[PDB]
Amino acid sequence: DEAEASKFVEEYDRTSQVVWNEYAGANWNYNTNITTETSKILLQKNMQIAQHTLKYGTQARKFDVNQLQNTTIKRIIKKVQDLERAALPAQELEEYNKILLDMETTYSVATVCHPQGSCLQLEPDLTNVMATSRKYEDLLWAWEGWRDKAGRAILQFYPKYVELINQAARLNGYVDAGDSWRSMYETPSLEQDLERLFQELQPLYLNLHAYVRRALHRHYGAQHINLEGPIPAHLLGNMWAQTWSNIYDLVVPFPSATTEAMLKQGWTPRRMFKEADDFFTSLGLLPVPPEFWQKSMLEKPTDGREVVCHASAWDFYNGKDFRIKQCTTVNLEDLVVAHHEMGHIQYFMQYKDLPVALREGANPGFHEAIGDVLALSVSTPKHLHSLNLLSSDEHDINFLMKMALDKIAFIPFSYLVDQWRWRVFDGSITKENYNQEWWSLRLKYQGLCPPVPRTQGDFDPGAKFHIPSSVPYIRYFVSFIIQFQFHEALCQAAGHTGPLHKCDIYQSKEAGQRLATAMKLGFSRPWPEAMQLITGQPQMSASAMLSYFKPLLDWLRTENELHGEKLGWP
Ligand SMILES: *[C@@H]1O[C@H](CO[C@@H]2O[C@@H](C)[C@@H](O)[C@@H](O)[C@@H]2O)[C@@H](O[C@@H]2O[C@H](CO)[C@@H](O[C@@H]3O[C@H](CO[C@H]4O[C@H](CO)[C@@H](O)[C@H](O[C@H]5O[C@H](CO)[C@@H](O)[C@H](O)[C@@H]5O)[C@@H]4O)[C@@H](O)[C@H](O)[C@@H]3O)[C@H](O)[C@H]2NC(C)=O)[C@H](O)[C@H]1NC(C)=O
Ligand SMILES: C[C@H](N[C@@H](CCc1ccccc1)C(=O)O)C(=O)N1Cc2ccccc2C[C@H]1C(=O)O
Ligand SMILES: [Cl-]
Ligand SMILES: [Cl-]
Ligand code: NA
Ligand SMILES: [Zn+2]
């Protein structure tokens, strides 16, 4: 009985590794070569994994986990009881798989065209426009056009998607898909805990917002920026106004105090990933295997192939084959993304000897945080100078501002995406109100407004990758808080004293060992245990992020007071 459960999970593990390896292959092949042939093979392999999931999930529900003694086996069996989409009847499963493929393909191949002119793709063309253009009308063209071509094209699929993902969730014991997603944290108090974290970041965000709004007023003109109102959503350097540091040049605190350098000094996608690999091994963490260099797709193909560019990290479930797929551009932003992705690979490597059911991060935010922690150190002026990419309190404030434009601005954005989705999933937001409710949250949390009134048929959420790709978002909110807790702890372990923002953990084997111990746990233990291993305490806390940015909070409050700024908006 305990012995039958044990046999049970050993069979599940051997067979799952095979079937999931085959599925991952097919998924990779489609993602790196969108065609009717790779699509067919993918939709077929979907049916194979579904059949396996159904078989072993059915058997897992036969056990009473309330009676099982071994806590590992109990946990594994409990997890395998969740069939996900494989719970759906065949007709619905087929329709759901097709909807998901159609959504992700629509997003990844959408283009925005000038008449009798060229057609731009999101990566790299529209990304580049949003980062570098300082002309209202040109930014508006890219911003609106991307929504018109990607967002509006997702709308036809989204209501049925919601029906079917919710139907699957109910068949697995949840009330809706949002309930199921939140369950990944195993934290009954999650919604309140996240809300309290968000509230703690509000002083810093409102101060940053007002400061940036002032700067935008200077460049884009008084007639286009209301100093007591929300900021137009196309002016922040990024398609979603999720991270703002591409407009650093417009907001630099101290003018008198890297892309050109990276290009001129011969950086390439492969060198960028080598740098990241080197950073991991400097901490005594694992190098990526030779296979990774052979099989990864580290730049957009030139050969014609249509691909899913949006960067991702892949585990092929055999303990050996790990890959990144990224349409890498040579710049510092993308170097940060490369490190983000390499953190996923590092996690995959660290937990590769666990049973597959426990091959996940302690929670999804932990998986998102690892690579970002290393990138915090990469980003420091000291470290960028060490890489030759660069040649005082003023310098300090400038650097904190650059960091804040990405890390603090992202907090409200990352919070809001799943506040919207949880309310779609629970039925609170119907299809008639999708776009209005998206904008009411964009206002409430980020203090943004759309530069052109939205119209019938718009579906702006569809223009953000994780929406059509059905990837949960709250993990990134969690990540952006906890990564600073990890940085604080690893900097302490490495013996750093003085301001946390001056910390660089490069070469610290003590920092590496802290992270490795936690990563090796996988999903085997409640996530607070992993939090405590790394930090010495069990909770999510904004204290570390606040500590990092303290000198900037102080500077921004003084600066905003001198200009008589009215924080917030109506
Ligand atoms: C409750 O049961 C758990 C689980 O027990 C194991 O799994 C069940 C299904 C049975 O098959 C049982 O025989 C197994 O032991 C108990 O936890 C285990 O306890 C043992 C003994 O302390 C511990 O042993 C260590 O294993 C470490 C890592 O092992 C893996 O990596 C090896 C080298 O890479 C390799 O030989 C194996 O790797 C494969 O294993 C995965 C699972 O099958 C597979 O998916 C993957 O592809 C891997 O390649 C090996 O499993 C190693 O570092 C140490 O030296 C130890 O020998 C296990 O780590 C531990 N397992 C887990 C998941 O915790 C637990 O003790 C028990 N409780 C009680 C009170 O009885
Ligand atoms: C680049 C990354 N891509 C996802 C891809 C996630 C994925 C999961 C399952 C199937 C396919 C894709 C990731 O690897 O988690 C990303 O989506 N962000 C990281 C990041 C990096 C820098 C700044 C912000 C963010 C958040 C997020 C994003 O860009 O929206
Ligand atoms: Cl939007
Ligand atoms: Cl998540
Ligand atoms: Na994208
Ligand atoms: Zn990630």
Side-chain angles (χ1 to χ4, degrees):
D1 174 346
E2 202 67 40
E4 280 201 11
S6 201
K7 167 174 64 190
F8 170 76
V9 305
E10 299 162 352
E11 174 177 327
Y12 174 82
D13 195 62
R14 119 190 155 261
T15 60
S16 296
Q17 286 181 38
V18 175
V19 170
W20 280 87
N21 175 267
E22 292 181 7
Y23 175 75
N27 195 26
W28 175 275
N29 292 345
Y30 183 72
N31 268 252
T32 60
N33 190 8
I34 294 166
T35 67
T36 49
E37 302 95 313
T38 54
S39 159
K40 256 183 224 166
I41 291 180
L42 179 57
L43 286 173
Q44 179 265 304
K45 292 300 201 188
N46 260 111
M47 286 326 185
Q48 188 181 226
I49 28 165
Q51 166 192 15
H52 171 88
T53 300
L54 181 57
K55 177 170 161 176
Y56 285 85
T58 296
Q59 297 176 189
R61 292 177 179 194
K62 296 192 281 259
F63 291 89
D64 189 346
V65 133
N66 292 322
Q67 323 287 304
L68 289 183
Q69 285 310 294
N70 179 293
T71 60
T72 299
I73 288 170
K74 180 183 146 144
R75 186 158 178 80
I76 290 165
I77 287 176
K78 183 52 173 81
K79 180 132 184 265
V80 175
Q81 294 180 336
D82 188 348
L83 314 191
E84 306 278 9
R85 71 184 67 167
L88 289 170
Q91 181 261 302
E92 283 93 332
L93 179 54
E94 168 172 10
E95 181 181 3
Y96 184 61
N97 284 340
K98 178 69 153 54
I99 279 166
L100 287 178
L101 160 83
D102 286 354
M103 293 199 295
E104 74 180 342
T105 300
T106 298
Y107 182 93
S108 277
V109 307
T111 66
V112 182
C113 300
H114 296 103
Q116 295 83 90
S118 42
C119 295
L120 279 73
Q121 299 173 274
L122 174 62
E123 298 195 30
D125 313 310
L126 301 162
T127 293
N128 289 356
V129 170
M130 297 307 293
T132 68
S133 177
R134 303 295 186 249
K135 296 178 65 219
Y136 194 99
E137 297 290 327
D138 294 344
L139 289 169
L140 178 58
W141 183 88
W143 183 95
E144 185 61 52
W146 181 247
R147 285 157 185 72
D148 291 353
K149 299 299 308 288
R152 297 180 64 86
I154 299 301
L155 179 57
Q156 68 155 305
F157 304 111
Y158 210 74
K160 182 68 62 170
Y161 159 77
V162 168
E163 185 184 318
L164 292 170
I165 197 176
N166 277 342
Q167 182 186 353
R170 292 188 314 269
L171 289 165
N172 288 298
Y174 297 102
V175 297
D176 62 59
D179 177 38
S180 176
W181 284 10
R182 287 188 304 268
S183 83
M184 295 186 278
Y185 293 82
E186 307 187 305
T187 303
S189 57
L190 188 67
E191 293 192 7
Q192 179 66 113
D193 292 342
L194 297 174
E195 183 65 39
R196 289 193 185 127
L197 289 168
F198 170 75
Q199 298 286 332
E200 287 183 278
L201 262 291
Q202 282 278 96
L204 255 175
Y205 182 67
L206 291 178
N207 279 280
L208 180 69
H209 179 281
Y211 177 80
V212 169
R213 184 173 57 194
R214 171 74 59 174
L216 293 173
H217 183 268
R218 191 164 54 236
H219 177 81
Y220 288 108
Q223 292 279 358
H224 306 297
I225 303 292
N226 178 350
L227 289 167
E228 302 180 351
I231 303 172
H234 63 313
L235 302 181
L236 291 306
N238 172 270
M239 183 59 84
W240 304 282
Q242 73 185 49
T243 48
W244 299 359
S245 69
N246 290 318
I247 65 160
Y248 174 73
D249 56 318
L250 296 184
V251 313
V252 183
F254 293 102
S256 62
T258 59
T259 299
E260 301 171 25
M262 287 179 77
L263 291 165
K264 186 69 184 81
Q265 299 184 36
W267 289 64
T268 64
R270 198 156 297 263
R271 166 98 148 262
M272 291 165 68
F273 287 90
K274 292 271 174 171
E275 179 282 314
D277 194 54
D278 180 70
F279 202 123
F280 275 100
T281 58
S282 83
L283 308 181
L285 296 171
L286 293 162
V288 300
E291 183 180 5
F292 167 104
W293 298 108
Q294 292 311 299
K295 304 193 176 171
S296 291
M297 190 201 88
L298 301 184
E299 34 194 295
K300 195 171 182 183
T302 51
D303 67 358
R305 285 181 280 167
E306 299 234 71
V307 307
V308 178
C309 269
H310 183 99
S312 52
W314 297 64
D315 190 344
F316 288 80
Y317 306 103
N318 66 359
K320 300 180 283 179
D321 188 353
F322 318 97
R323 307 178 199 170
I324 284 167
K325 183 199 51 53
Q326 176 172 340
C327 290
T328 314
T329 295
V330 180
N331 60 44
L332 177 60
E333 186 179 348
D334 259 10
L335 184 60
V336 174
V337 177
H339 278 265
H340 179 86
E341 299 298 340
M342 290 283 275
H344 292 304
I345 300 293
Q346 184 72 204
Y347 228 136
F348 302 156
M349 296 188 294
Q350 286 288 342
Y351 59 46
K352 68 185 177 82
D353 299 326
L354 294 174
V356 305
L358 302 181
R359 291 187 206 165
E360 298 177 21
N363 69 42
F366 274 63
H367 219 310
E368 302 303 333
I370 301 298
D372 291 26
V373 171
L374 278 66
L376 290 167
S377 285
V378 172
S379 291
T380 64
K382 143 182 173 174
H383 195 89
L384 295 172
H385 174 68
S386 78
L387 290 173
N388 260 265
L389 299 178
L390 298 171
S391 284
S392 88
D393 294 355
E394 285 181 1
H395 282 273
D396 260 339
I397 295 305
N398 281 349
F399 171 59
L400 284 170
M401 176 65 66
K402 179 158 191 185
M403 295 304 305
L405 284 170
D406 292 339
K407 299 295 183 179
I408 299 301
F410 188 78
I411 289 296
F413 178 83
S414 63
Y415 189 66
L416 79 89
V417 173
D418 287 349
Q419 295 305 328
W420 183 85
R421 278 196 293 205
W422 293 344
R423 292 170 51 225
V424 169
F425 296 146
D426 81 6
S428 296
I429 300 170
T430 62
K431 59 190 165 74
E432 301 76 10
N433 297 297
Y434 283 160
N435 211 67
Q436 159 201 284
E437 289 294 336
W438 174 257
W439 283 97
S440 290
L441 295 172
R442 296 271 280 177
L443 178 63
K444 177 177 176 173
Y445 290 116
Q446 296 178 273
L448 305 178
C449 56
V452 169
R454 316 311 309 139
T455 60
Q456 275 189 20
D458 287 338
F459 182 61
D460 299 325
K464 178 57 191 173
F465 172 81
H466 299 74
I467 300 294
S469 279
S470 197
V471 180
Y473 213 84
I474 196 70
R475 50 190 62 180
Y476 302 112
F477 175 89
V478 171
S479 174
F480 273 48
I481 295 158
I482 72 178
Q483 67 188 242
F484 286 89
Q485 298 179 249
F486 298 172
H487 184 64
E488 186 180 64
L490 299 189
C491 295
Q492 189 263 9
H496 166 88
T497 58
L500 179 58
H501 73 271
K502 298 198 216 264
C503 175
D504 178 0
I505 63 173
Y506 188 78
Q507 315 210 81
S508 175
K509 300 310 177 292
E510 295 82 3
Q513 195 44 241
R514 275 293 163 82
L515 282 188
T517 297
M519 288 187 278
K520 287 181 152 57
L521 292 179
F523 193 65
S524 68
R525 299 301 300 154
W527 72 257
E529 294 187 12
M531 181 55 84
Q532 182 138 336
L533 280 168
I534 297 171
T535 71
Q537 67 76 52
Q539 298 306 317
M540 297 176 283
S541 176
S543 299
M545 188 176 211
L546 292 173
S547 177
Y548 183 108
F549 287 109
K550 175 66 175 159
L552 187 69
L553 177 59
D554 290 347
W555 186 88
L556 288 163
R557 288 177 166 141
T558 300
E559 175 74 357
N560 289 330
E561 291 169 17
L562 213 46
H563 291 79
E565 298 300 358
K566 297 186 199 161
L567 300 186
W569 49 79

